[PDB]
């Protein structure tokens, strides 16, 4: 009866969390959304009046442009999709569950293979992340044991969950700052935008509003792609481990809550 | 030295998998991409000639349209973002790490809160999925014990990983087929497109090319949203559990191959 109680309590807490978050986000974003819509409508009306076109013709043109954009066309010299490098980027975003969406299959055959590829590939990445976490814990224990032994001259050393969480948080912060230091100059982004993109990509949410390495010519462009790959990989690993540790802590907190209640 | 060997072997296998997948996807998609780009270019050239519009004017108009679309505008009628139910949909896609991207924060304050909200919410959903998996295993064991006891008239009953994987696969197939039973007449999609969307959403990849339940008016629109919520929740749970079980099986296969290599 304890497991059922914990399950029910977690469900109720998550529901309340969702309701509160929805309220807050609406309060923050509604006015900006309305203002943007009004500005776009004014621009469209002015353009239509200037060149004495028709609303239907512009509607058809915009529909064609939306189809082209789904195809992969953009307005600023984007890199080609579905070349070998683009395909590599797409598969990397698929196996990790990020799914930016800047490149998606468009033909029958490219969707079946996507299903099978993801089905056989996502578990492998999850297993890789788990193995990395285990290796990190072992190395931390070894370092602590060695440091204590060396300082004495003046296995059972597994660190607690709290220290592992602190270490993962520090590593994530450092990786995000280092990645942003490179994204900001190469891209036309601000530092805060770089941090926001780093968090969105590392957590595997992948909205797709900001995507890196999509500007065709990128000066060097040889080391830049390798650096982007390395940074995304490390960030994903660190954030995945941090989320799992935080989940363990939340589970302990829920038991404590249940135990206190009586 | 065994753990390091398994780690290295998994890394090499994943790298080969990525290379092969990239090659296959490029081979499948490059011709379609080129044809679509050519068709869009022809359409744009034809439109420009007919109305005597300069290409810079059309470029500016399309840039404005891309800015507007980034705020939620579409050629077809779509439900508003950030009123109260768009916010609920957004938070649901955020906590589950799906990230469709049809709704994204656009203001400072809506991005900081997004970071903190995700940081505190994703671990809760992961814990909920793990608890669900444990409950499912317990119920399966109880059912098997009861069935065996009944068949006798003529704890240690937990099923093996193989049977749990088979059950999860069957449940996922049934849920996907039932969900696609709708989403075909309500969304005007083909059945295969419905299955593709179900897999993309359930796995938490969330490309965003196909998003459900946003067409402004949706007939009832009261039960439809509830049904969409329930279907997505169940699919996400089942696919998450299936991925974890498959990862365990892959780990066993790796240990066996390592033992085979001596
Ligand atoms: C060497 C370690 C092997 C393990 C690989 C495991 C998982 C891969 C997961 C995610 C990769 C992040 C996306 C890379 C994007 C390529 C960028 C570019 O090309 O511009
Ligand atoms: C009662 C169980 C509580 C636990 C819920 C936990 C996590 C929620 C995760 C995913 C739900 C995503 C569905 C998207 C919302 C659709 C709403 C709509 O179409 O408008
Ligand atoms: C969305 C889930 C919210 C998580 C609720 C956190 C509960 C806080 C309890 C903190 C005390 C538990 C730690 C042990 C105290 C000795
Ligand atoms: C993306 C990497 C996938 C690697 C899958 C490895 C498959 C190995 C098959 C081995 C089958 C025998 C194992 C079961 C015997 C105990
Ligand atoms: C144009 C060069 C792109 C480089 C990205 C591919 C190489 C990384 C995969 C191999 C890592 C061991
Ligand atoms: C204009 C030169 C930009 C090149 C950026 C170099 C990126 C490599 C950093 C180190 C890789 C880990
Ligand atoms: C003996 C130790 C060397 C092999 C372990 C390294 C495998 C990962 C290297 C790349 C970082 C993900
Ligand atoms: C217990 C489930 C709580 C969430 C219900 C909200 C979704 C229904 C939307 C109805 C809007 C007309
Ligand atoms: C006319 C459109 C009616 C569609 C309503 C959907 C009914 C689904 C309810 C069951 C939820 C699991
Ligand atoms: C005894 C009842 C406790 C469990 C009820 C929780 C119902 C939530 C269903 C969510 C399944 C994905
Ligand atoms: C038309 C190519 C078919 C690709 C699907 C392969 C599934 C194993
Ligand atoms: C025993 C060596 C473990 C490898 C750790 C690598 C972390 C970047
Ligand atoms: C840590 C990488 C620093 C890159 C600086 C780029 C300056 C043009
Ligand atoms: C000019 C391309 C350099 C690629 C670096 C790869 C390092 C293993
Ligand atoms: C303008 C109000 C922003 C509040 C940010 C939320 C901090 C947790
Ligand atoms: C005793 C188990 C009850 C909860 C399981 C519900 C599965 C849908
Ligand atoms: C389980 C859903 C049944 C099909 C609903 C759509 C009927 C037009
Ligand atoms: C008319 C609104 C119906 C809402 C579904 C019931 C929620 C339990
Ligand atoms: C946490 C309380 C929810 C508020 C609903 C508007
Ligand atoms: C957490 C309650 C939301 C307050 C903003 C209206
Ligand atoms: C967390 C409270 C934010 C209030 C939005 C105006
Ligand atoms: C551009 C081809 C890259 C080769 C990968 C080793
Ligand atoms: C068009 C055939 C679809 C096959 C289902 C996997
Ligand atoms: C005690 C500090 C060790 C950190 C391991 C990365
Ligand atoms: C089996 C690896 C060969 C590389 C093919 C491009
Ligand atoms: C061995 C995987 C396939 C290699 C093709 C680039
Ligand atoms: C599975 C390897 C693909 C080679 C054809 C491009
Ligand atoms: C592994 C090689 C397959 C070739 C596909 C065209
Ligand atoms: C393995 C699939 C081959 C693709 C042929 C175009
Ligand atoms: C407008 C919908 C209200 C939801 C409260 C449960
Ligand atoms: C979380 C960093 C704050 C950014 C201020 C613009
Ligand atoms: C035969 C066992 C059935 C379990 C499915 C919930
Ligand atoms: K994800
Ligand atoms: K996504
Ligand atoms: K995702
Ligand atoms: K996305």
Swiss-Prot record, chains A, B:
K(+) 4 binds at residues 97, 204. Expressed in microglia (at protein level). One of its GO terms (biological process) is regulation of NLRP3 inflammasome complex assembly. It is a multi-pass membrane protein. The keyword Isomerase does not apply. It catalyses: K(+)(in) = K(+)(out). Residues 204-209 are annotated as: Selectivity filter 2. Residues 97-102 are annotated as: Selectivity filter 1. Glycans are attached at residues 46, 52. K(+) 3 binds at residues 99, 206-207. The chain crosses the membrane at residues 7-27, 112-132, 161-181, 230-250. It is found in: Cell membrane. Homodimer. Heterodimer with KCNK12. Each subunit contributes two pore-forming domains 1 and 2 which assemble to form a single pore with M2 and M4 transmembrane helices lining the central cavity and M1 and M3 facing the lipid bilayer. The transmembrane helices are bridged by the selectivity filters 1 and 2 that coordinate the permeant ions. Up to four ions can simultaneously occupy the selectivity filter and at least two elementary charges must translocate across the filter to convert it into the open conformation. This is Potassium channel subfamily K member 13. It comes from Homo sapiens. The gene is KCNK13.
């Amino acid at each position: 009866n304890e497991d059922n109680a914990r399950f029910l309590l977690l469900a109720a807490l998550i529901v309340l969390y969702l309701l509160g978050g929805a309220a807050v986000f609406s309060a923050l974003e509604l006015a900006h959304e309305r203002q943007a819509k009004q500005r776009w409508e004014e621009r469209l009306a002015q353009f239509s009046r200037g060149h004495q076109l028709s609303r239907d013709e512009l509607r058809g043109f915009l529909r064609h442009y939306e189809e082209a954009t789904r195809a992969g066309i953009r307005v600023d010299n984007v890199r080609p999709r579905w070349d070998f490098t683009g395909a590599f980027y797409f598969v990397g975003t698929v196996v990790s569950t990020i799914g930016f969406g800047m490149t998606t299959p468009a033909t029958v055959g490219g969707k079946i293979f996507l299903i099978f590829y993801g089905l056989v590939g996502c578990p492998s990445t999850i297993l890789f992340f788990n193995l990395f976490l285990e290796r990190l814990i072992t190395i931390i224990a070894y370092i602590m044991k060695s440091c204590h032994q060396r300082q004495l001259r003046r296995a059972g050393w597994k660190p607690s969950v709290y220290y592992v969480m602190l270490i993962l948080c520090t590593a994530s912060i450092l990786i995000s700052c280092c990645a942003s230091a490179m994204y900001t100059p190469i891209e036309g982004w601000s530092y805060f935008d770089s941090l926001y993109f780093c968090f969105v990509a590392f957590s595997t949410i992948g909205f797709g509003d900001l995507v890196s390495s999509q500007n065709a010519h990128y000066e060097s462009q040889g080391l830049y792609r390798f650096a982007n790959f390395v940074f995304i990989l490390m960030g994903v690993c660190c954030i995945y481990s941090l989320f799992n540790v935080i989940s363990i802590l939340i589970k302990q907190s829920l038991n404590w809550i249940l135990r206190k209640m009586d």
